[PDB]
Design a protein around this motif. Structure first.
Motif, PDB file in Angstrom:
ATOM      1  N   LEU A 245     -35.518  75.800  13.941  1.00 56.44           N
ATOM      2  CA  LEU A 245     -35.025  76.337  15.211  1.00 56.44           C
ATOM      3  C   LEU A 245     -35.374  75.360  16.340  1.00 56.44           C
ATOM      4  O   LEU A 245     -34.515  75.080  17.171  1.00 56.44           O
ATOM      5  N   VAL A 246     -36.604  74.792  16.339  1.00 52.27           N
ATOM      6  CA  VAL A 246     -37.020  73.799  17.332  1.00 52.27           C
ATOM      7  C   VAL A 246     -36.119  72.572  17.218  1.00 52.27           C
ATOM      8  O   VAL A 246     -35.668  72.070  18.237  1.00 52.27           O
ATOM      9  N   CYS A 247     -35.752  72.163  15.985  1.00 43.91           N
ATOM     10  CA  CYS A 247     -34.831  71.048  15.749  1.00 43.91           C
ATOM     11  C   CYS A 247     -33.504  71.277  16.443  1.00 43.91           C
ATOM     12  O   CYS A 247     -33.015  70.383  17.111  1.00 43.91           O
ATOM     13  N   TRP A 248     -32.946  72.481  16.323  1.00 48.36           N
ATOM     14  CA  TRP A 248     -31.680  72.830  16.959  1.00 48.36           C
ATOM     15  C   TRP A 248     -31.804  72.891  18.483  1.00 48.36           C
ATOM     16  O   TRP A 248     -30.998  72.287  19.175  1.00 48.36           O
ATOM     17  N   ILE A 249     -32.814  73.602  19.000  1.00 52.17           N
ATOM     18  CA  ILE A 249     -33.064  73.755  20.431  1.00 52.17           C
ATOM     19  C   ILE A 249     -33.208  72.380  21.112  1.00 52.17           C
ATOM     20  O   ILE A 249     -32.562  72.112  22.133  1.00 52.17           O
ATOM     21  N   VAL A 250     -34.033  71.506  20.518  1.00 52.84           N
ATOM     22  CA  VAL A 250     -34.249  70.153  21.010  1.00 52.84           C
ATOM     23  C   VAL A 250     -32.965  69.311  20.950  1.00 52.84           C
ATOM     24  O   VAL A 250     -32.609  68.689  21.943  1.00 52.84           O
ATOM     25  N   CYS A 251     -32.258  69.323  19.819  1.00 50.21           N
ATOM     26  CA  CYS A 251     -31.010  68.577  19.668  1.00 50.21           C
ATOM     27  C   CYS A 251     -29.925  69.027  20.648  1.00 50.21           C
ATOM     28  O   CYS A 251     -29.210  68.190  21.197  1.00 50.21           O
ATOM     29  N   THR A 252     -29.805  70.341  20.870  1.00 47.86           N
ATOM     30  CA  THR A 252     -28.801  70.897  21.770  1.00 47.86           C
ATOM     31  C   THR A 252     -29.032  70.486  23.225  1.00 47.86           C
ATOM     32  O   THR A 252     -28.084  70.087  23.903  1.00 47.86           O
ATOM     33  N   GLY A 253     -30.279  70.540  23.680  1.00 47.13           N
ATOM     34  CA  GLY A 253     -30.625  70.147  25.040  1.00 47.13           C
ATOM     35  C   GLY A 253     -30.571  68.647  25.264  1.00 47.13           C
ATOM     36  O   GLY A 253     -30.364  68.193  26.389  1.00 47.13           O
ATOM     37  N   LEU A 254     -30.784  67.865  24.198  1.00 43.54           N
ATOM     38  CA  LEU A 254     -30.693  66.406  24.233  1.00 43.54           C
ATOM     39  C   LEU A 254     -29.217  65.969  24.266  1.00 43.54           C
ATOM     40  O   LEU A 254     -28.917  64.926  24.831  1.00 43.54           O
ATOM     41  N   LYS A 255     -28.302  66.765  23.669  1.00 41.07           N
ATOM     42  CA  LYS A 255     -26.861  66.520  23.661  1.00 41.07           C
ATOM     43  C   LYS A 255     -26.313  66.689  25.089  1.00 41.07           C
ATOM     44  O   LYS A 255     -25.503  65.870  25.534  1.00 41.07           O
ATOM     45  N   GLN A 256     -26.797  67.719  25.823  1.00 40.44           N
ATOM     46  CA  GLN A 256     -26.414  67.990  27.219  1.00 40.44           C
ATOM     47  C   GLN A 256     -26.900  66.875  28.148  1.00 40.44           C
ATOM     48  O   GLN A 256     -26.198  66.500  29.087  1.00 40.44           O
ATOM     49  N   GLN A 257     -28.090  66.333  27.863  1.00 42.64           N
ATOM     50  CA  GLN A 257     -28.711  65.218  28.581  1.00 42.64           C
ATOM     51  C   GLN A 257     -27.915  63.908  28.357  1.00 42.64           C
ATOM     52  O   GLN A 257     -27.895  63.042  29.232  1.00 42.64           O
ATOM     53  N   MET A 258     -27.266  63.773  27.184  1.00 45.32           N
ATOM     54  CA  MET A 258     -26.423  62.635  26.825  1.00 45.32           C
ATOM     55  C   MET A 258     -25.058  62.707  27.515  1.00 45.32           C
ATOM     56  O   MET A 258     -24.434  61.662  27.719  1.00 45.32           O
ATOM     57  N   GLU A 259     -24.575  63.931  27.843  1.00 41.75           N
ATOM     58  CA  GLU A 259     -23.316  64.126  28.571  1.00 41.75           C
ATOM     59  C   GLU A 259     -23.486  63.568  29.994  1.00 41.75           C
ATOM     60  O   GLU A 259     -22.609  62.856  30.486  1.00 41.75           O
ATOM     61  N   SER A 260     -24.638  63.855  30.629  1.00 40.46           N
ATOM     62  CA  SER A 260     -24.967  63.347  31.961  1.00 40.46           C
ATOM     63  C   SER A 260     -25.568  61.922  31.876  1.00 40.46           C
ATOM     64  O   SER A 260     -25.928  61.455  30.794  1.00 40.46           O
TER      65      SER A 260
END
Ligand SMILES: CCN1CCC[C@@H](Nc2ccc(-c3c(C)cc(C(F)(F)F)cc3O)nn2)C1
Ligand SMILES: Nc1ncnc2c1ncn2[C@@H]1O[C@H](COP(=O)(O)OP(=O)(O)O)[C@@H](O)[C@H]1O
Length: 488
Positions: A245-260
């Motif tokens: 779950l931490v893997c998903w939470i971290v990956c999802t928020g890092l994907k949003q950070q990559m958009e910006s």
């Protein structure tokens, strides 16, 4: 006979995890108390009678549901228990009512595609049936160990608690196999029902499977390598990423950070920090409907409702546009088969918003009565509600999401939490509620040394059992801030 083909077809379509399952499913580390999935029911070198009850214990977010769904899928595809089970029935415990009267036949039929399954044909070979109960600890309401009389007729309608108790105690279809997945908290309640169980533990992702998830999540090698390198650098995020779950939470928020246009960085140190960083990424309405989100979560925890209808969230303030935005944000999810039910992405997210309900700037907001129900099955144990309260109470820790919290009540809650640690550490005569190691997870969320040092003095002697690198990280922090007044 011919129905087994119709049933495996239905299972193969329903269990394709389209929220693909084969595409992102990463191997989970399972150890017996390493195990090959097919051999789970095979009796060891010593005994000859096959094992009928197998219990999977795992921490929140470890992947008990992903493992149970991957088992349903694998079996329906002829790759798991092909010669062992004719039927695998998936009992999703959060949708199960412990008061509604239903028979074992009614429950089995619920798992079927058609309205008229051949129920008498199915129960003909009980040993060829594997009942798979996902999330025992998520049975809403009180699970009583004193209920009865137990049932031995698969057609007699019984109250949900009597029905599951008779099924688990092996009274109803005694030679049918059982696979129960639960958080270790409920193992107290469950062990009293269990009949010769094989205990297996889901340890989550290996360091190798952690890298694998990151490279499966990101379809671009440069992005996957940049996100994994970030975790390799953060001791906390590297350690925490054993939980899928931490893997998903971290990956999802890092994907949003990559958009910006933001250089990859995550200075998170606590579970509260991870959740607030994830929820802050969604603040691009989340900040307008905060009181509604927290009131929905607190009611869902205090009145035992994991799944909410459209009418429930409409009552809490969340209109059609709000639920459709939260679903896109991946905060809410559509659940309960094809029925119009809703729920937070994870039980930990419901406990994060229940903890936030107690600190919101203006259910019972009295933290005294919340702490009185801690460690009890009938309220969900309140593990992350209390853990997230320690983290969010931290005044030397703020964000835009945390600025909407009342620092007037968080200082009163901070003093009520310190009285709690004092009571729980001193009176070690209690039979499990917050263990000493669990109190360390609470103090780790707190992170502020005035509180941690004041609370660590209440512990007379350090008595802990470490099992994971997370247990080491957390307990190491608490002991560092445990220095005597006279010391040196
Ligand atoms: C029974 C209560 N307690 C007793 C002391 C040992 C403690 N062991 C763990 C292990 C992992 C997690 C956990 C965390 C640290 C984060 C997340 C999240 F990131 F997904 F939120 C999910 C988790 O399951 N918690 N406790 C359990
Ligand atoms: N083996 C796995 N492979 C990939 N993702 C997984 C796996 N196990 C869990 N997850 C991730 O963790 C999230 C929550 O896991 P879940 O199985 O619901 O946990 P639990 O039932 O133990 O609380 C899923 O939404 C998914 O993203």
């Amino acid at each position: 006979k011919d129905y087994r083909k119709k049933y495996r077809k239905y299972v193969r379509s329903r269990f394709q995890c389209i929220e693909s399952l084969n595409k992102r499913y990463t191997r989970l580390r399972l150890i017996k108390e390493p195990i090959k999935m097919e051999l789970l029911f095979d009796p060891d070198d010593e005994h000859s009678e096959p094992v009928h009850t197998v219990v999977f214990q795992g921490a929140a977010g470890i992947g008990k549901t992903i493992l149970a769904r991957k088992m349903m899928l694998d079996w329906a595809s002829g790759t798991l228990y092909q010669d062992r089970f004719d039927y695998l029935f998936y009992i999703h415990c959060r949708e199960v009512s412990l008061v509604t009267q239903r028979s074992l036949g009614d429950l089995i039929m619920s798992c079927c595609p058609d309205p008229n399954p051949p129920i008498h044909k199915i129960v003909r070979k009980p040993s060829r049936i594997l009942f798979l109960m996902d999330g025992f600890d998520e049975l809403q309401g009180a699970f009583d160990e004193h209920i009865g009389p137990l049932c031995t007729d698969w057609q007699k309608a019984e109250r949900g608690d009597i029905l599951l108790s008779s099924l688990i105690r092996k009274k109803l279809l005694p030679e049918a196999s059982l696979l129960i997945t639960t958080r270790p908290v409920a193992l107290e309640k469950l062990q009293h029902l269990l009949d010769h169980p094989r205990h297996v533990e889901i340890l989550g992702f290996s360091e190798a499977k952690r890298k694998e998830y990151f490279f499966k999540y990101f379809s671009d090698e440069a992005q996957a390598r940049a996100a994994f390198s970030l975790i390799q650098e953060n001791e906390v995020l590297f350690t925490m990423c054993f939980i899928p779950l931490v893997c998903w939470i971290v990956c999802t928020g890092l994907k949003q950070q990559m958009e910006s246009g933001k250089s990859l960085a995550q200075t998170s140190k606590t579970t509260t920090a991870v959740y607030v960083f994830f929820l802050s990424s969604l603040l691009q309405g989340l900040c307008a409907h905060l009181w509604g989100l927290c009131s929905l979560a607190a009611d869902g925890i205090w009145n035992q409702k994991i799944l909410f209808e459209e009418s429930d969230l409409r009552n809490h303030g969340l209109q059609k546009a709000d639920v459709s935005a939260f679903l896109r944000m991946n905060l809410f999810q559509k659940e309960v088969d094809c029925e119009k039910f809703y729920s937070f992405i994870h039980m930990t997210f419901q406990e994060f918003f229940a903890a936030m309900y107690y600190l919101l700037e203006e259910p019972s907001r009295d933290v005294t009565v919340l702490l009185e129900n801690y460690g009890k099955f009938e309220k969900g144990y309140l593990i992350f509600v209390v853990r997230f309260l320690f983290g969010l109470v931290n005044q030397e820790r703020t964000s835009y999401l945390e600025k909407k919290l009342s620092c007037k009540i968080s200082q009163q809650i901070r003093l009520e939490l310190l009285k709690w640690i004092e009571v729980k550490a001193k009176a070690k005569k209690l039979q499990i509620q917050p263990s000493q190691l669990e109190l360390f997870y609470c103090l780790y969320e707190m992170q502020e040394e005035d509180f941690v040092q004041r609370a660590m003095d209440y512990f007379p002697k350090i008595e802990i059992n470490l099992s994971t690198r997370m247990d080491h990280m957390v307990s190491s922090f608490c002991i560092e801030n445990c220095h005597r007044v006279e010391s040196l």
